[PDB]
Design a binder for this molecule. Sequence first.
Ligand code: HEM
Ligand code: LS9
Length: 391
Amino acid sequence: KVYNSIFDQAYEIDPIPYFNFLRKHDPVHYEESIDAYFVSKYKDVKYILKNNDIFNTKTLAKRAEPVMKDRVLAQMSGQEHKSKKKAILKGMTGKYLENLMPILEKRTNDIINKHIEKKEIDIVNDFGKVFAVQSSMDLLGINLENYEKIREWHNGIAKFITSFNLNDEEIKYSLECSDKLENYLMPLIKDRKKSTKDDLISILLEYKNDENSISDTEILALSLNVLLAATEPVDKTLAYLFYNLLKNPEQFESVKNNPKLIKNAIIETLRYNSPVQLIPRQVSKPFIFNNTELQAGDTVICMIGSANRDPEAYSNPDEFNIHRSSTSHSQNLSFGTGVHTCVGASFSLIQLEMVAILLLKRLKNIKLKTMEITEHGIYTRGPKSMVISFD
Ligand code: HEM
Ligand SMILES: OB(O)c1cccnc1
């Protein structure tokens, strides 16, 4: 009946033509291979995410608990979700943020110093993948001894969450990584207990819910939740930001002339090349969009990239333009919206600005070497490589 499918080979290569087709001709599009409906329009994605009662987060456990061990923040609700989300935010705000940012500057400059004499650096593989995990470990309070293994294990677990129809051999690997990371972090939670340091794991340890703490297995799951979430989108967004700016030399010069424009450049990057592309929800009762009927138990999948390029929300939506301002403009859905909006949104914007400013400061006369990127992933999406040269 329908011949355009999310799982066509062409979609992962370039999904933009699919975004346009779906929004125009099938805004709630069924994919029988995973028995879910893909939602492409800004208005319907926002509606879904803003109504936690009709579209709930119970679709996560199946795609999480296997590798997470215990409950994840997204599966919580009520006063529990609010208070535990507030606890996590504490680890990237206030005094914790004042202490962390100088350390993230050290991580950034240490990486830069490793590549400066080669006169070129891969924003994805040389900087992004390394900085992202190290920053997430500093946020949690994990010493950087084993950042290599932590990277490997993180990849294996993320693969289980960001993939559809994994084969049995790929599943057992993701779990092995899940077991290894647990074996590593569990004794570290016990020590952070003996002598509490000023990090996120210590926050989770001292958290009181009616004078009742959370079991160490819940701390492990929440710590893993932060580790996976905070790492994945960093290398992607940094690569997209410098690539889009260098593909628009005039806007690159505007950022160099007004450093304050970098925040807007990051926001436009997140809209244009959304690193988190899909958000699933479970339908809790009969419902209808346009004339597509959904039943209790069905699965909807919000297409963040498509929504952020909806011409009903943005004028010239498929063009990168850091000068957007205010329907010709709307709030993008890169961090989601509603109850489960990204707890790390403010930190991410601050973290990403600090990194971009330092790269612009220390790498002079930046030139693009990767003239054409190849992007991979449909759940989380980024460039394979993004190499720049400098003096
Ligand atoms: C560019 C960076 C990031 C992007 C684009 C991003 C994107 C998102 C999105 C779209 C959601 C909504 C998920 C949903 O509704 O199911 C979300 C939620 C979440 N993100 Fe992020 N995120 C980023 C960085 C971070 C960081 C740095 C952290 C932690 C340090 C983090 C932790 C979380 C958590 C815990 C949630 C769940 C919130 C809840 O359920 O209440 N994210 N993120
Ligand atoms: O819900 B997610 O897939 C997610 C991924 C990366 C960062 N934050 C959230």
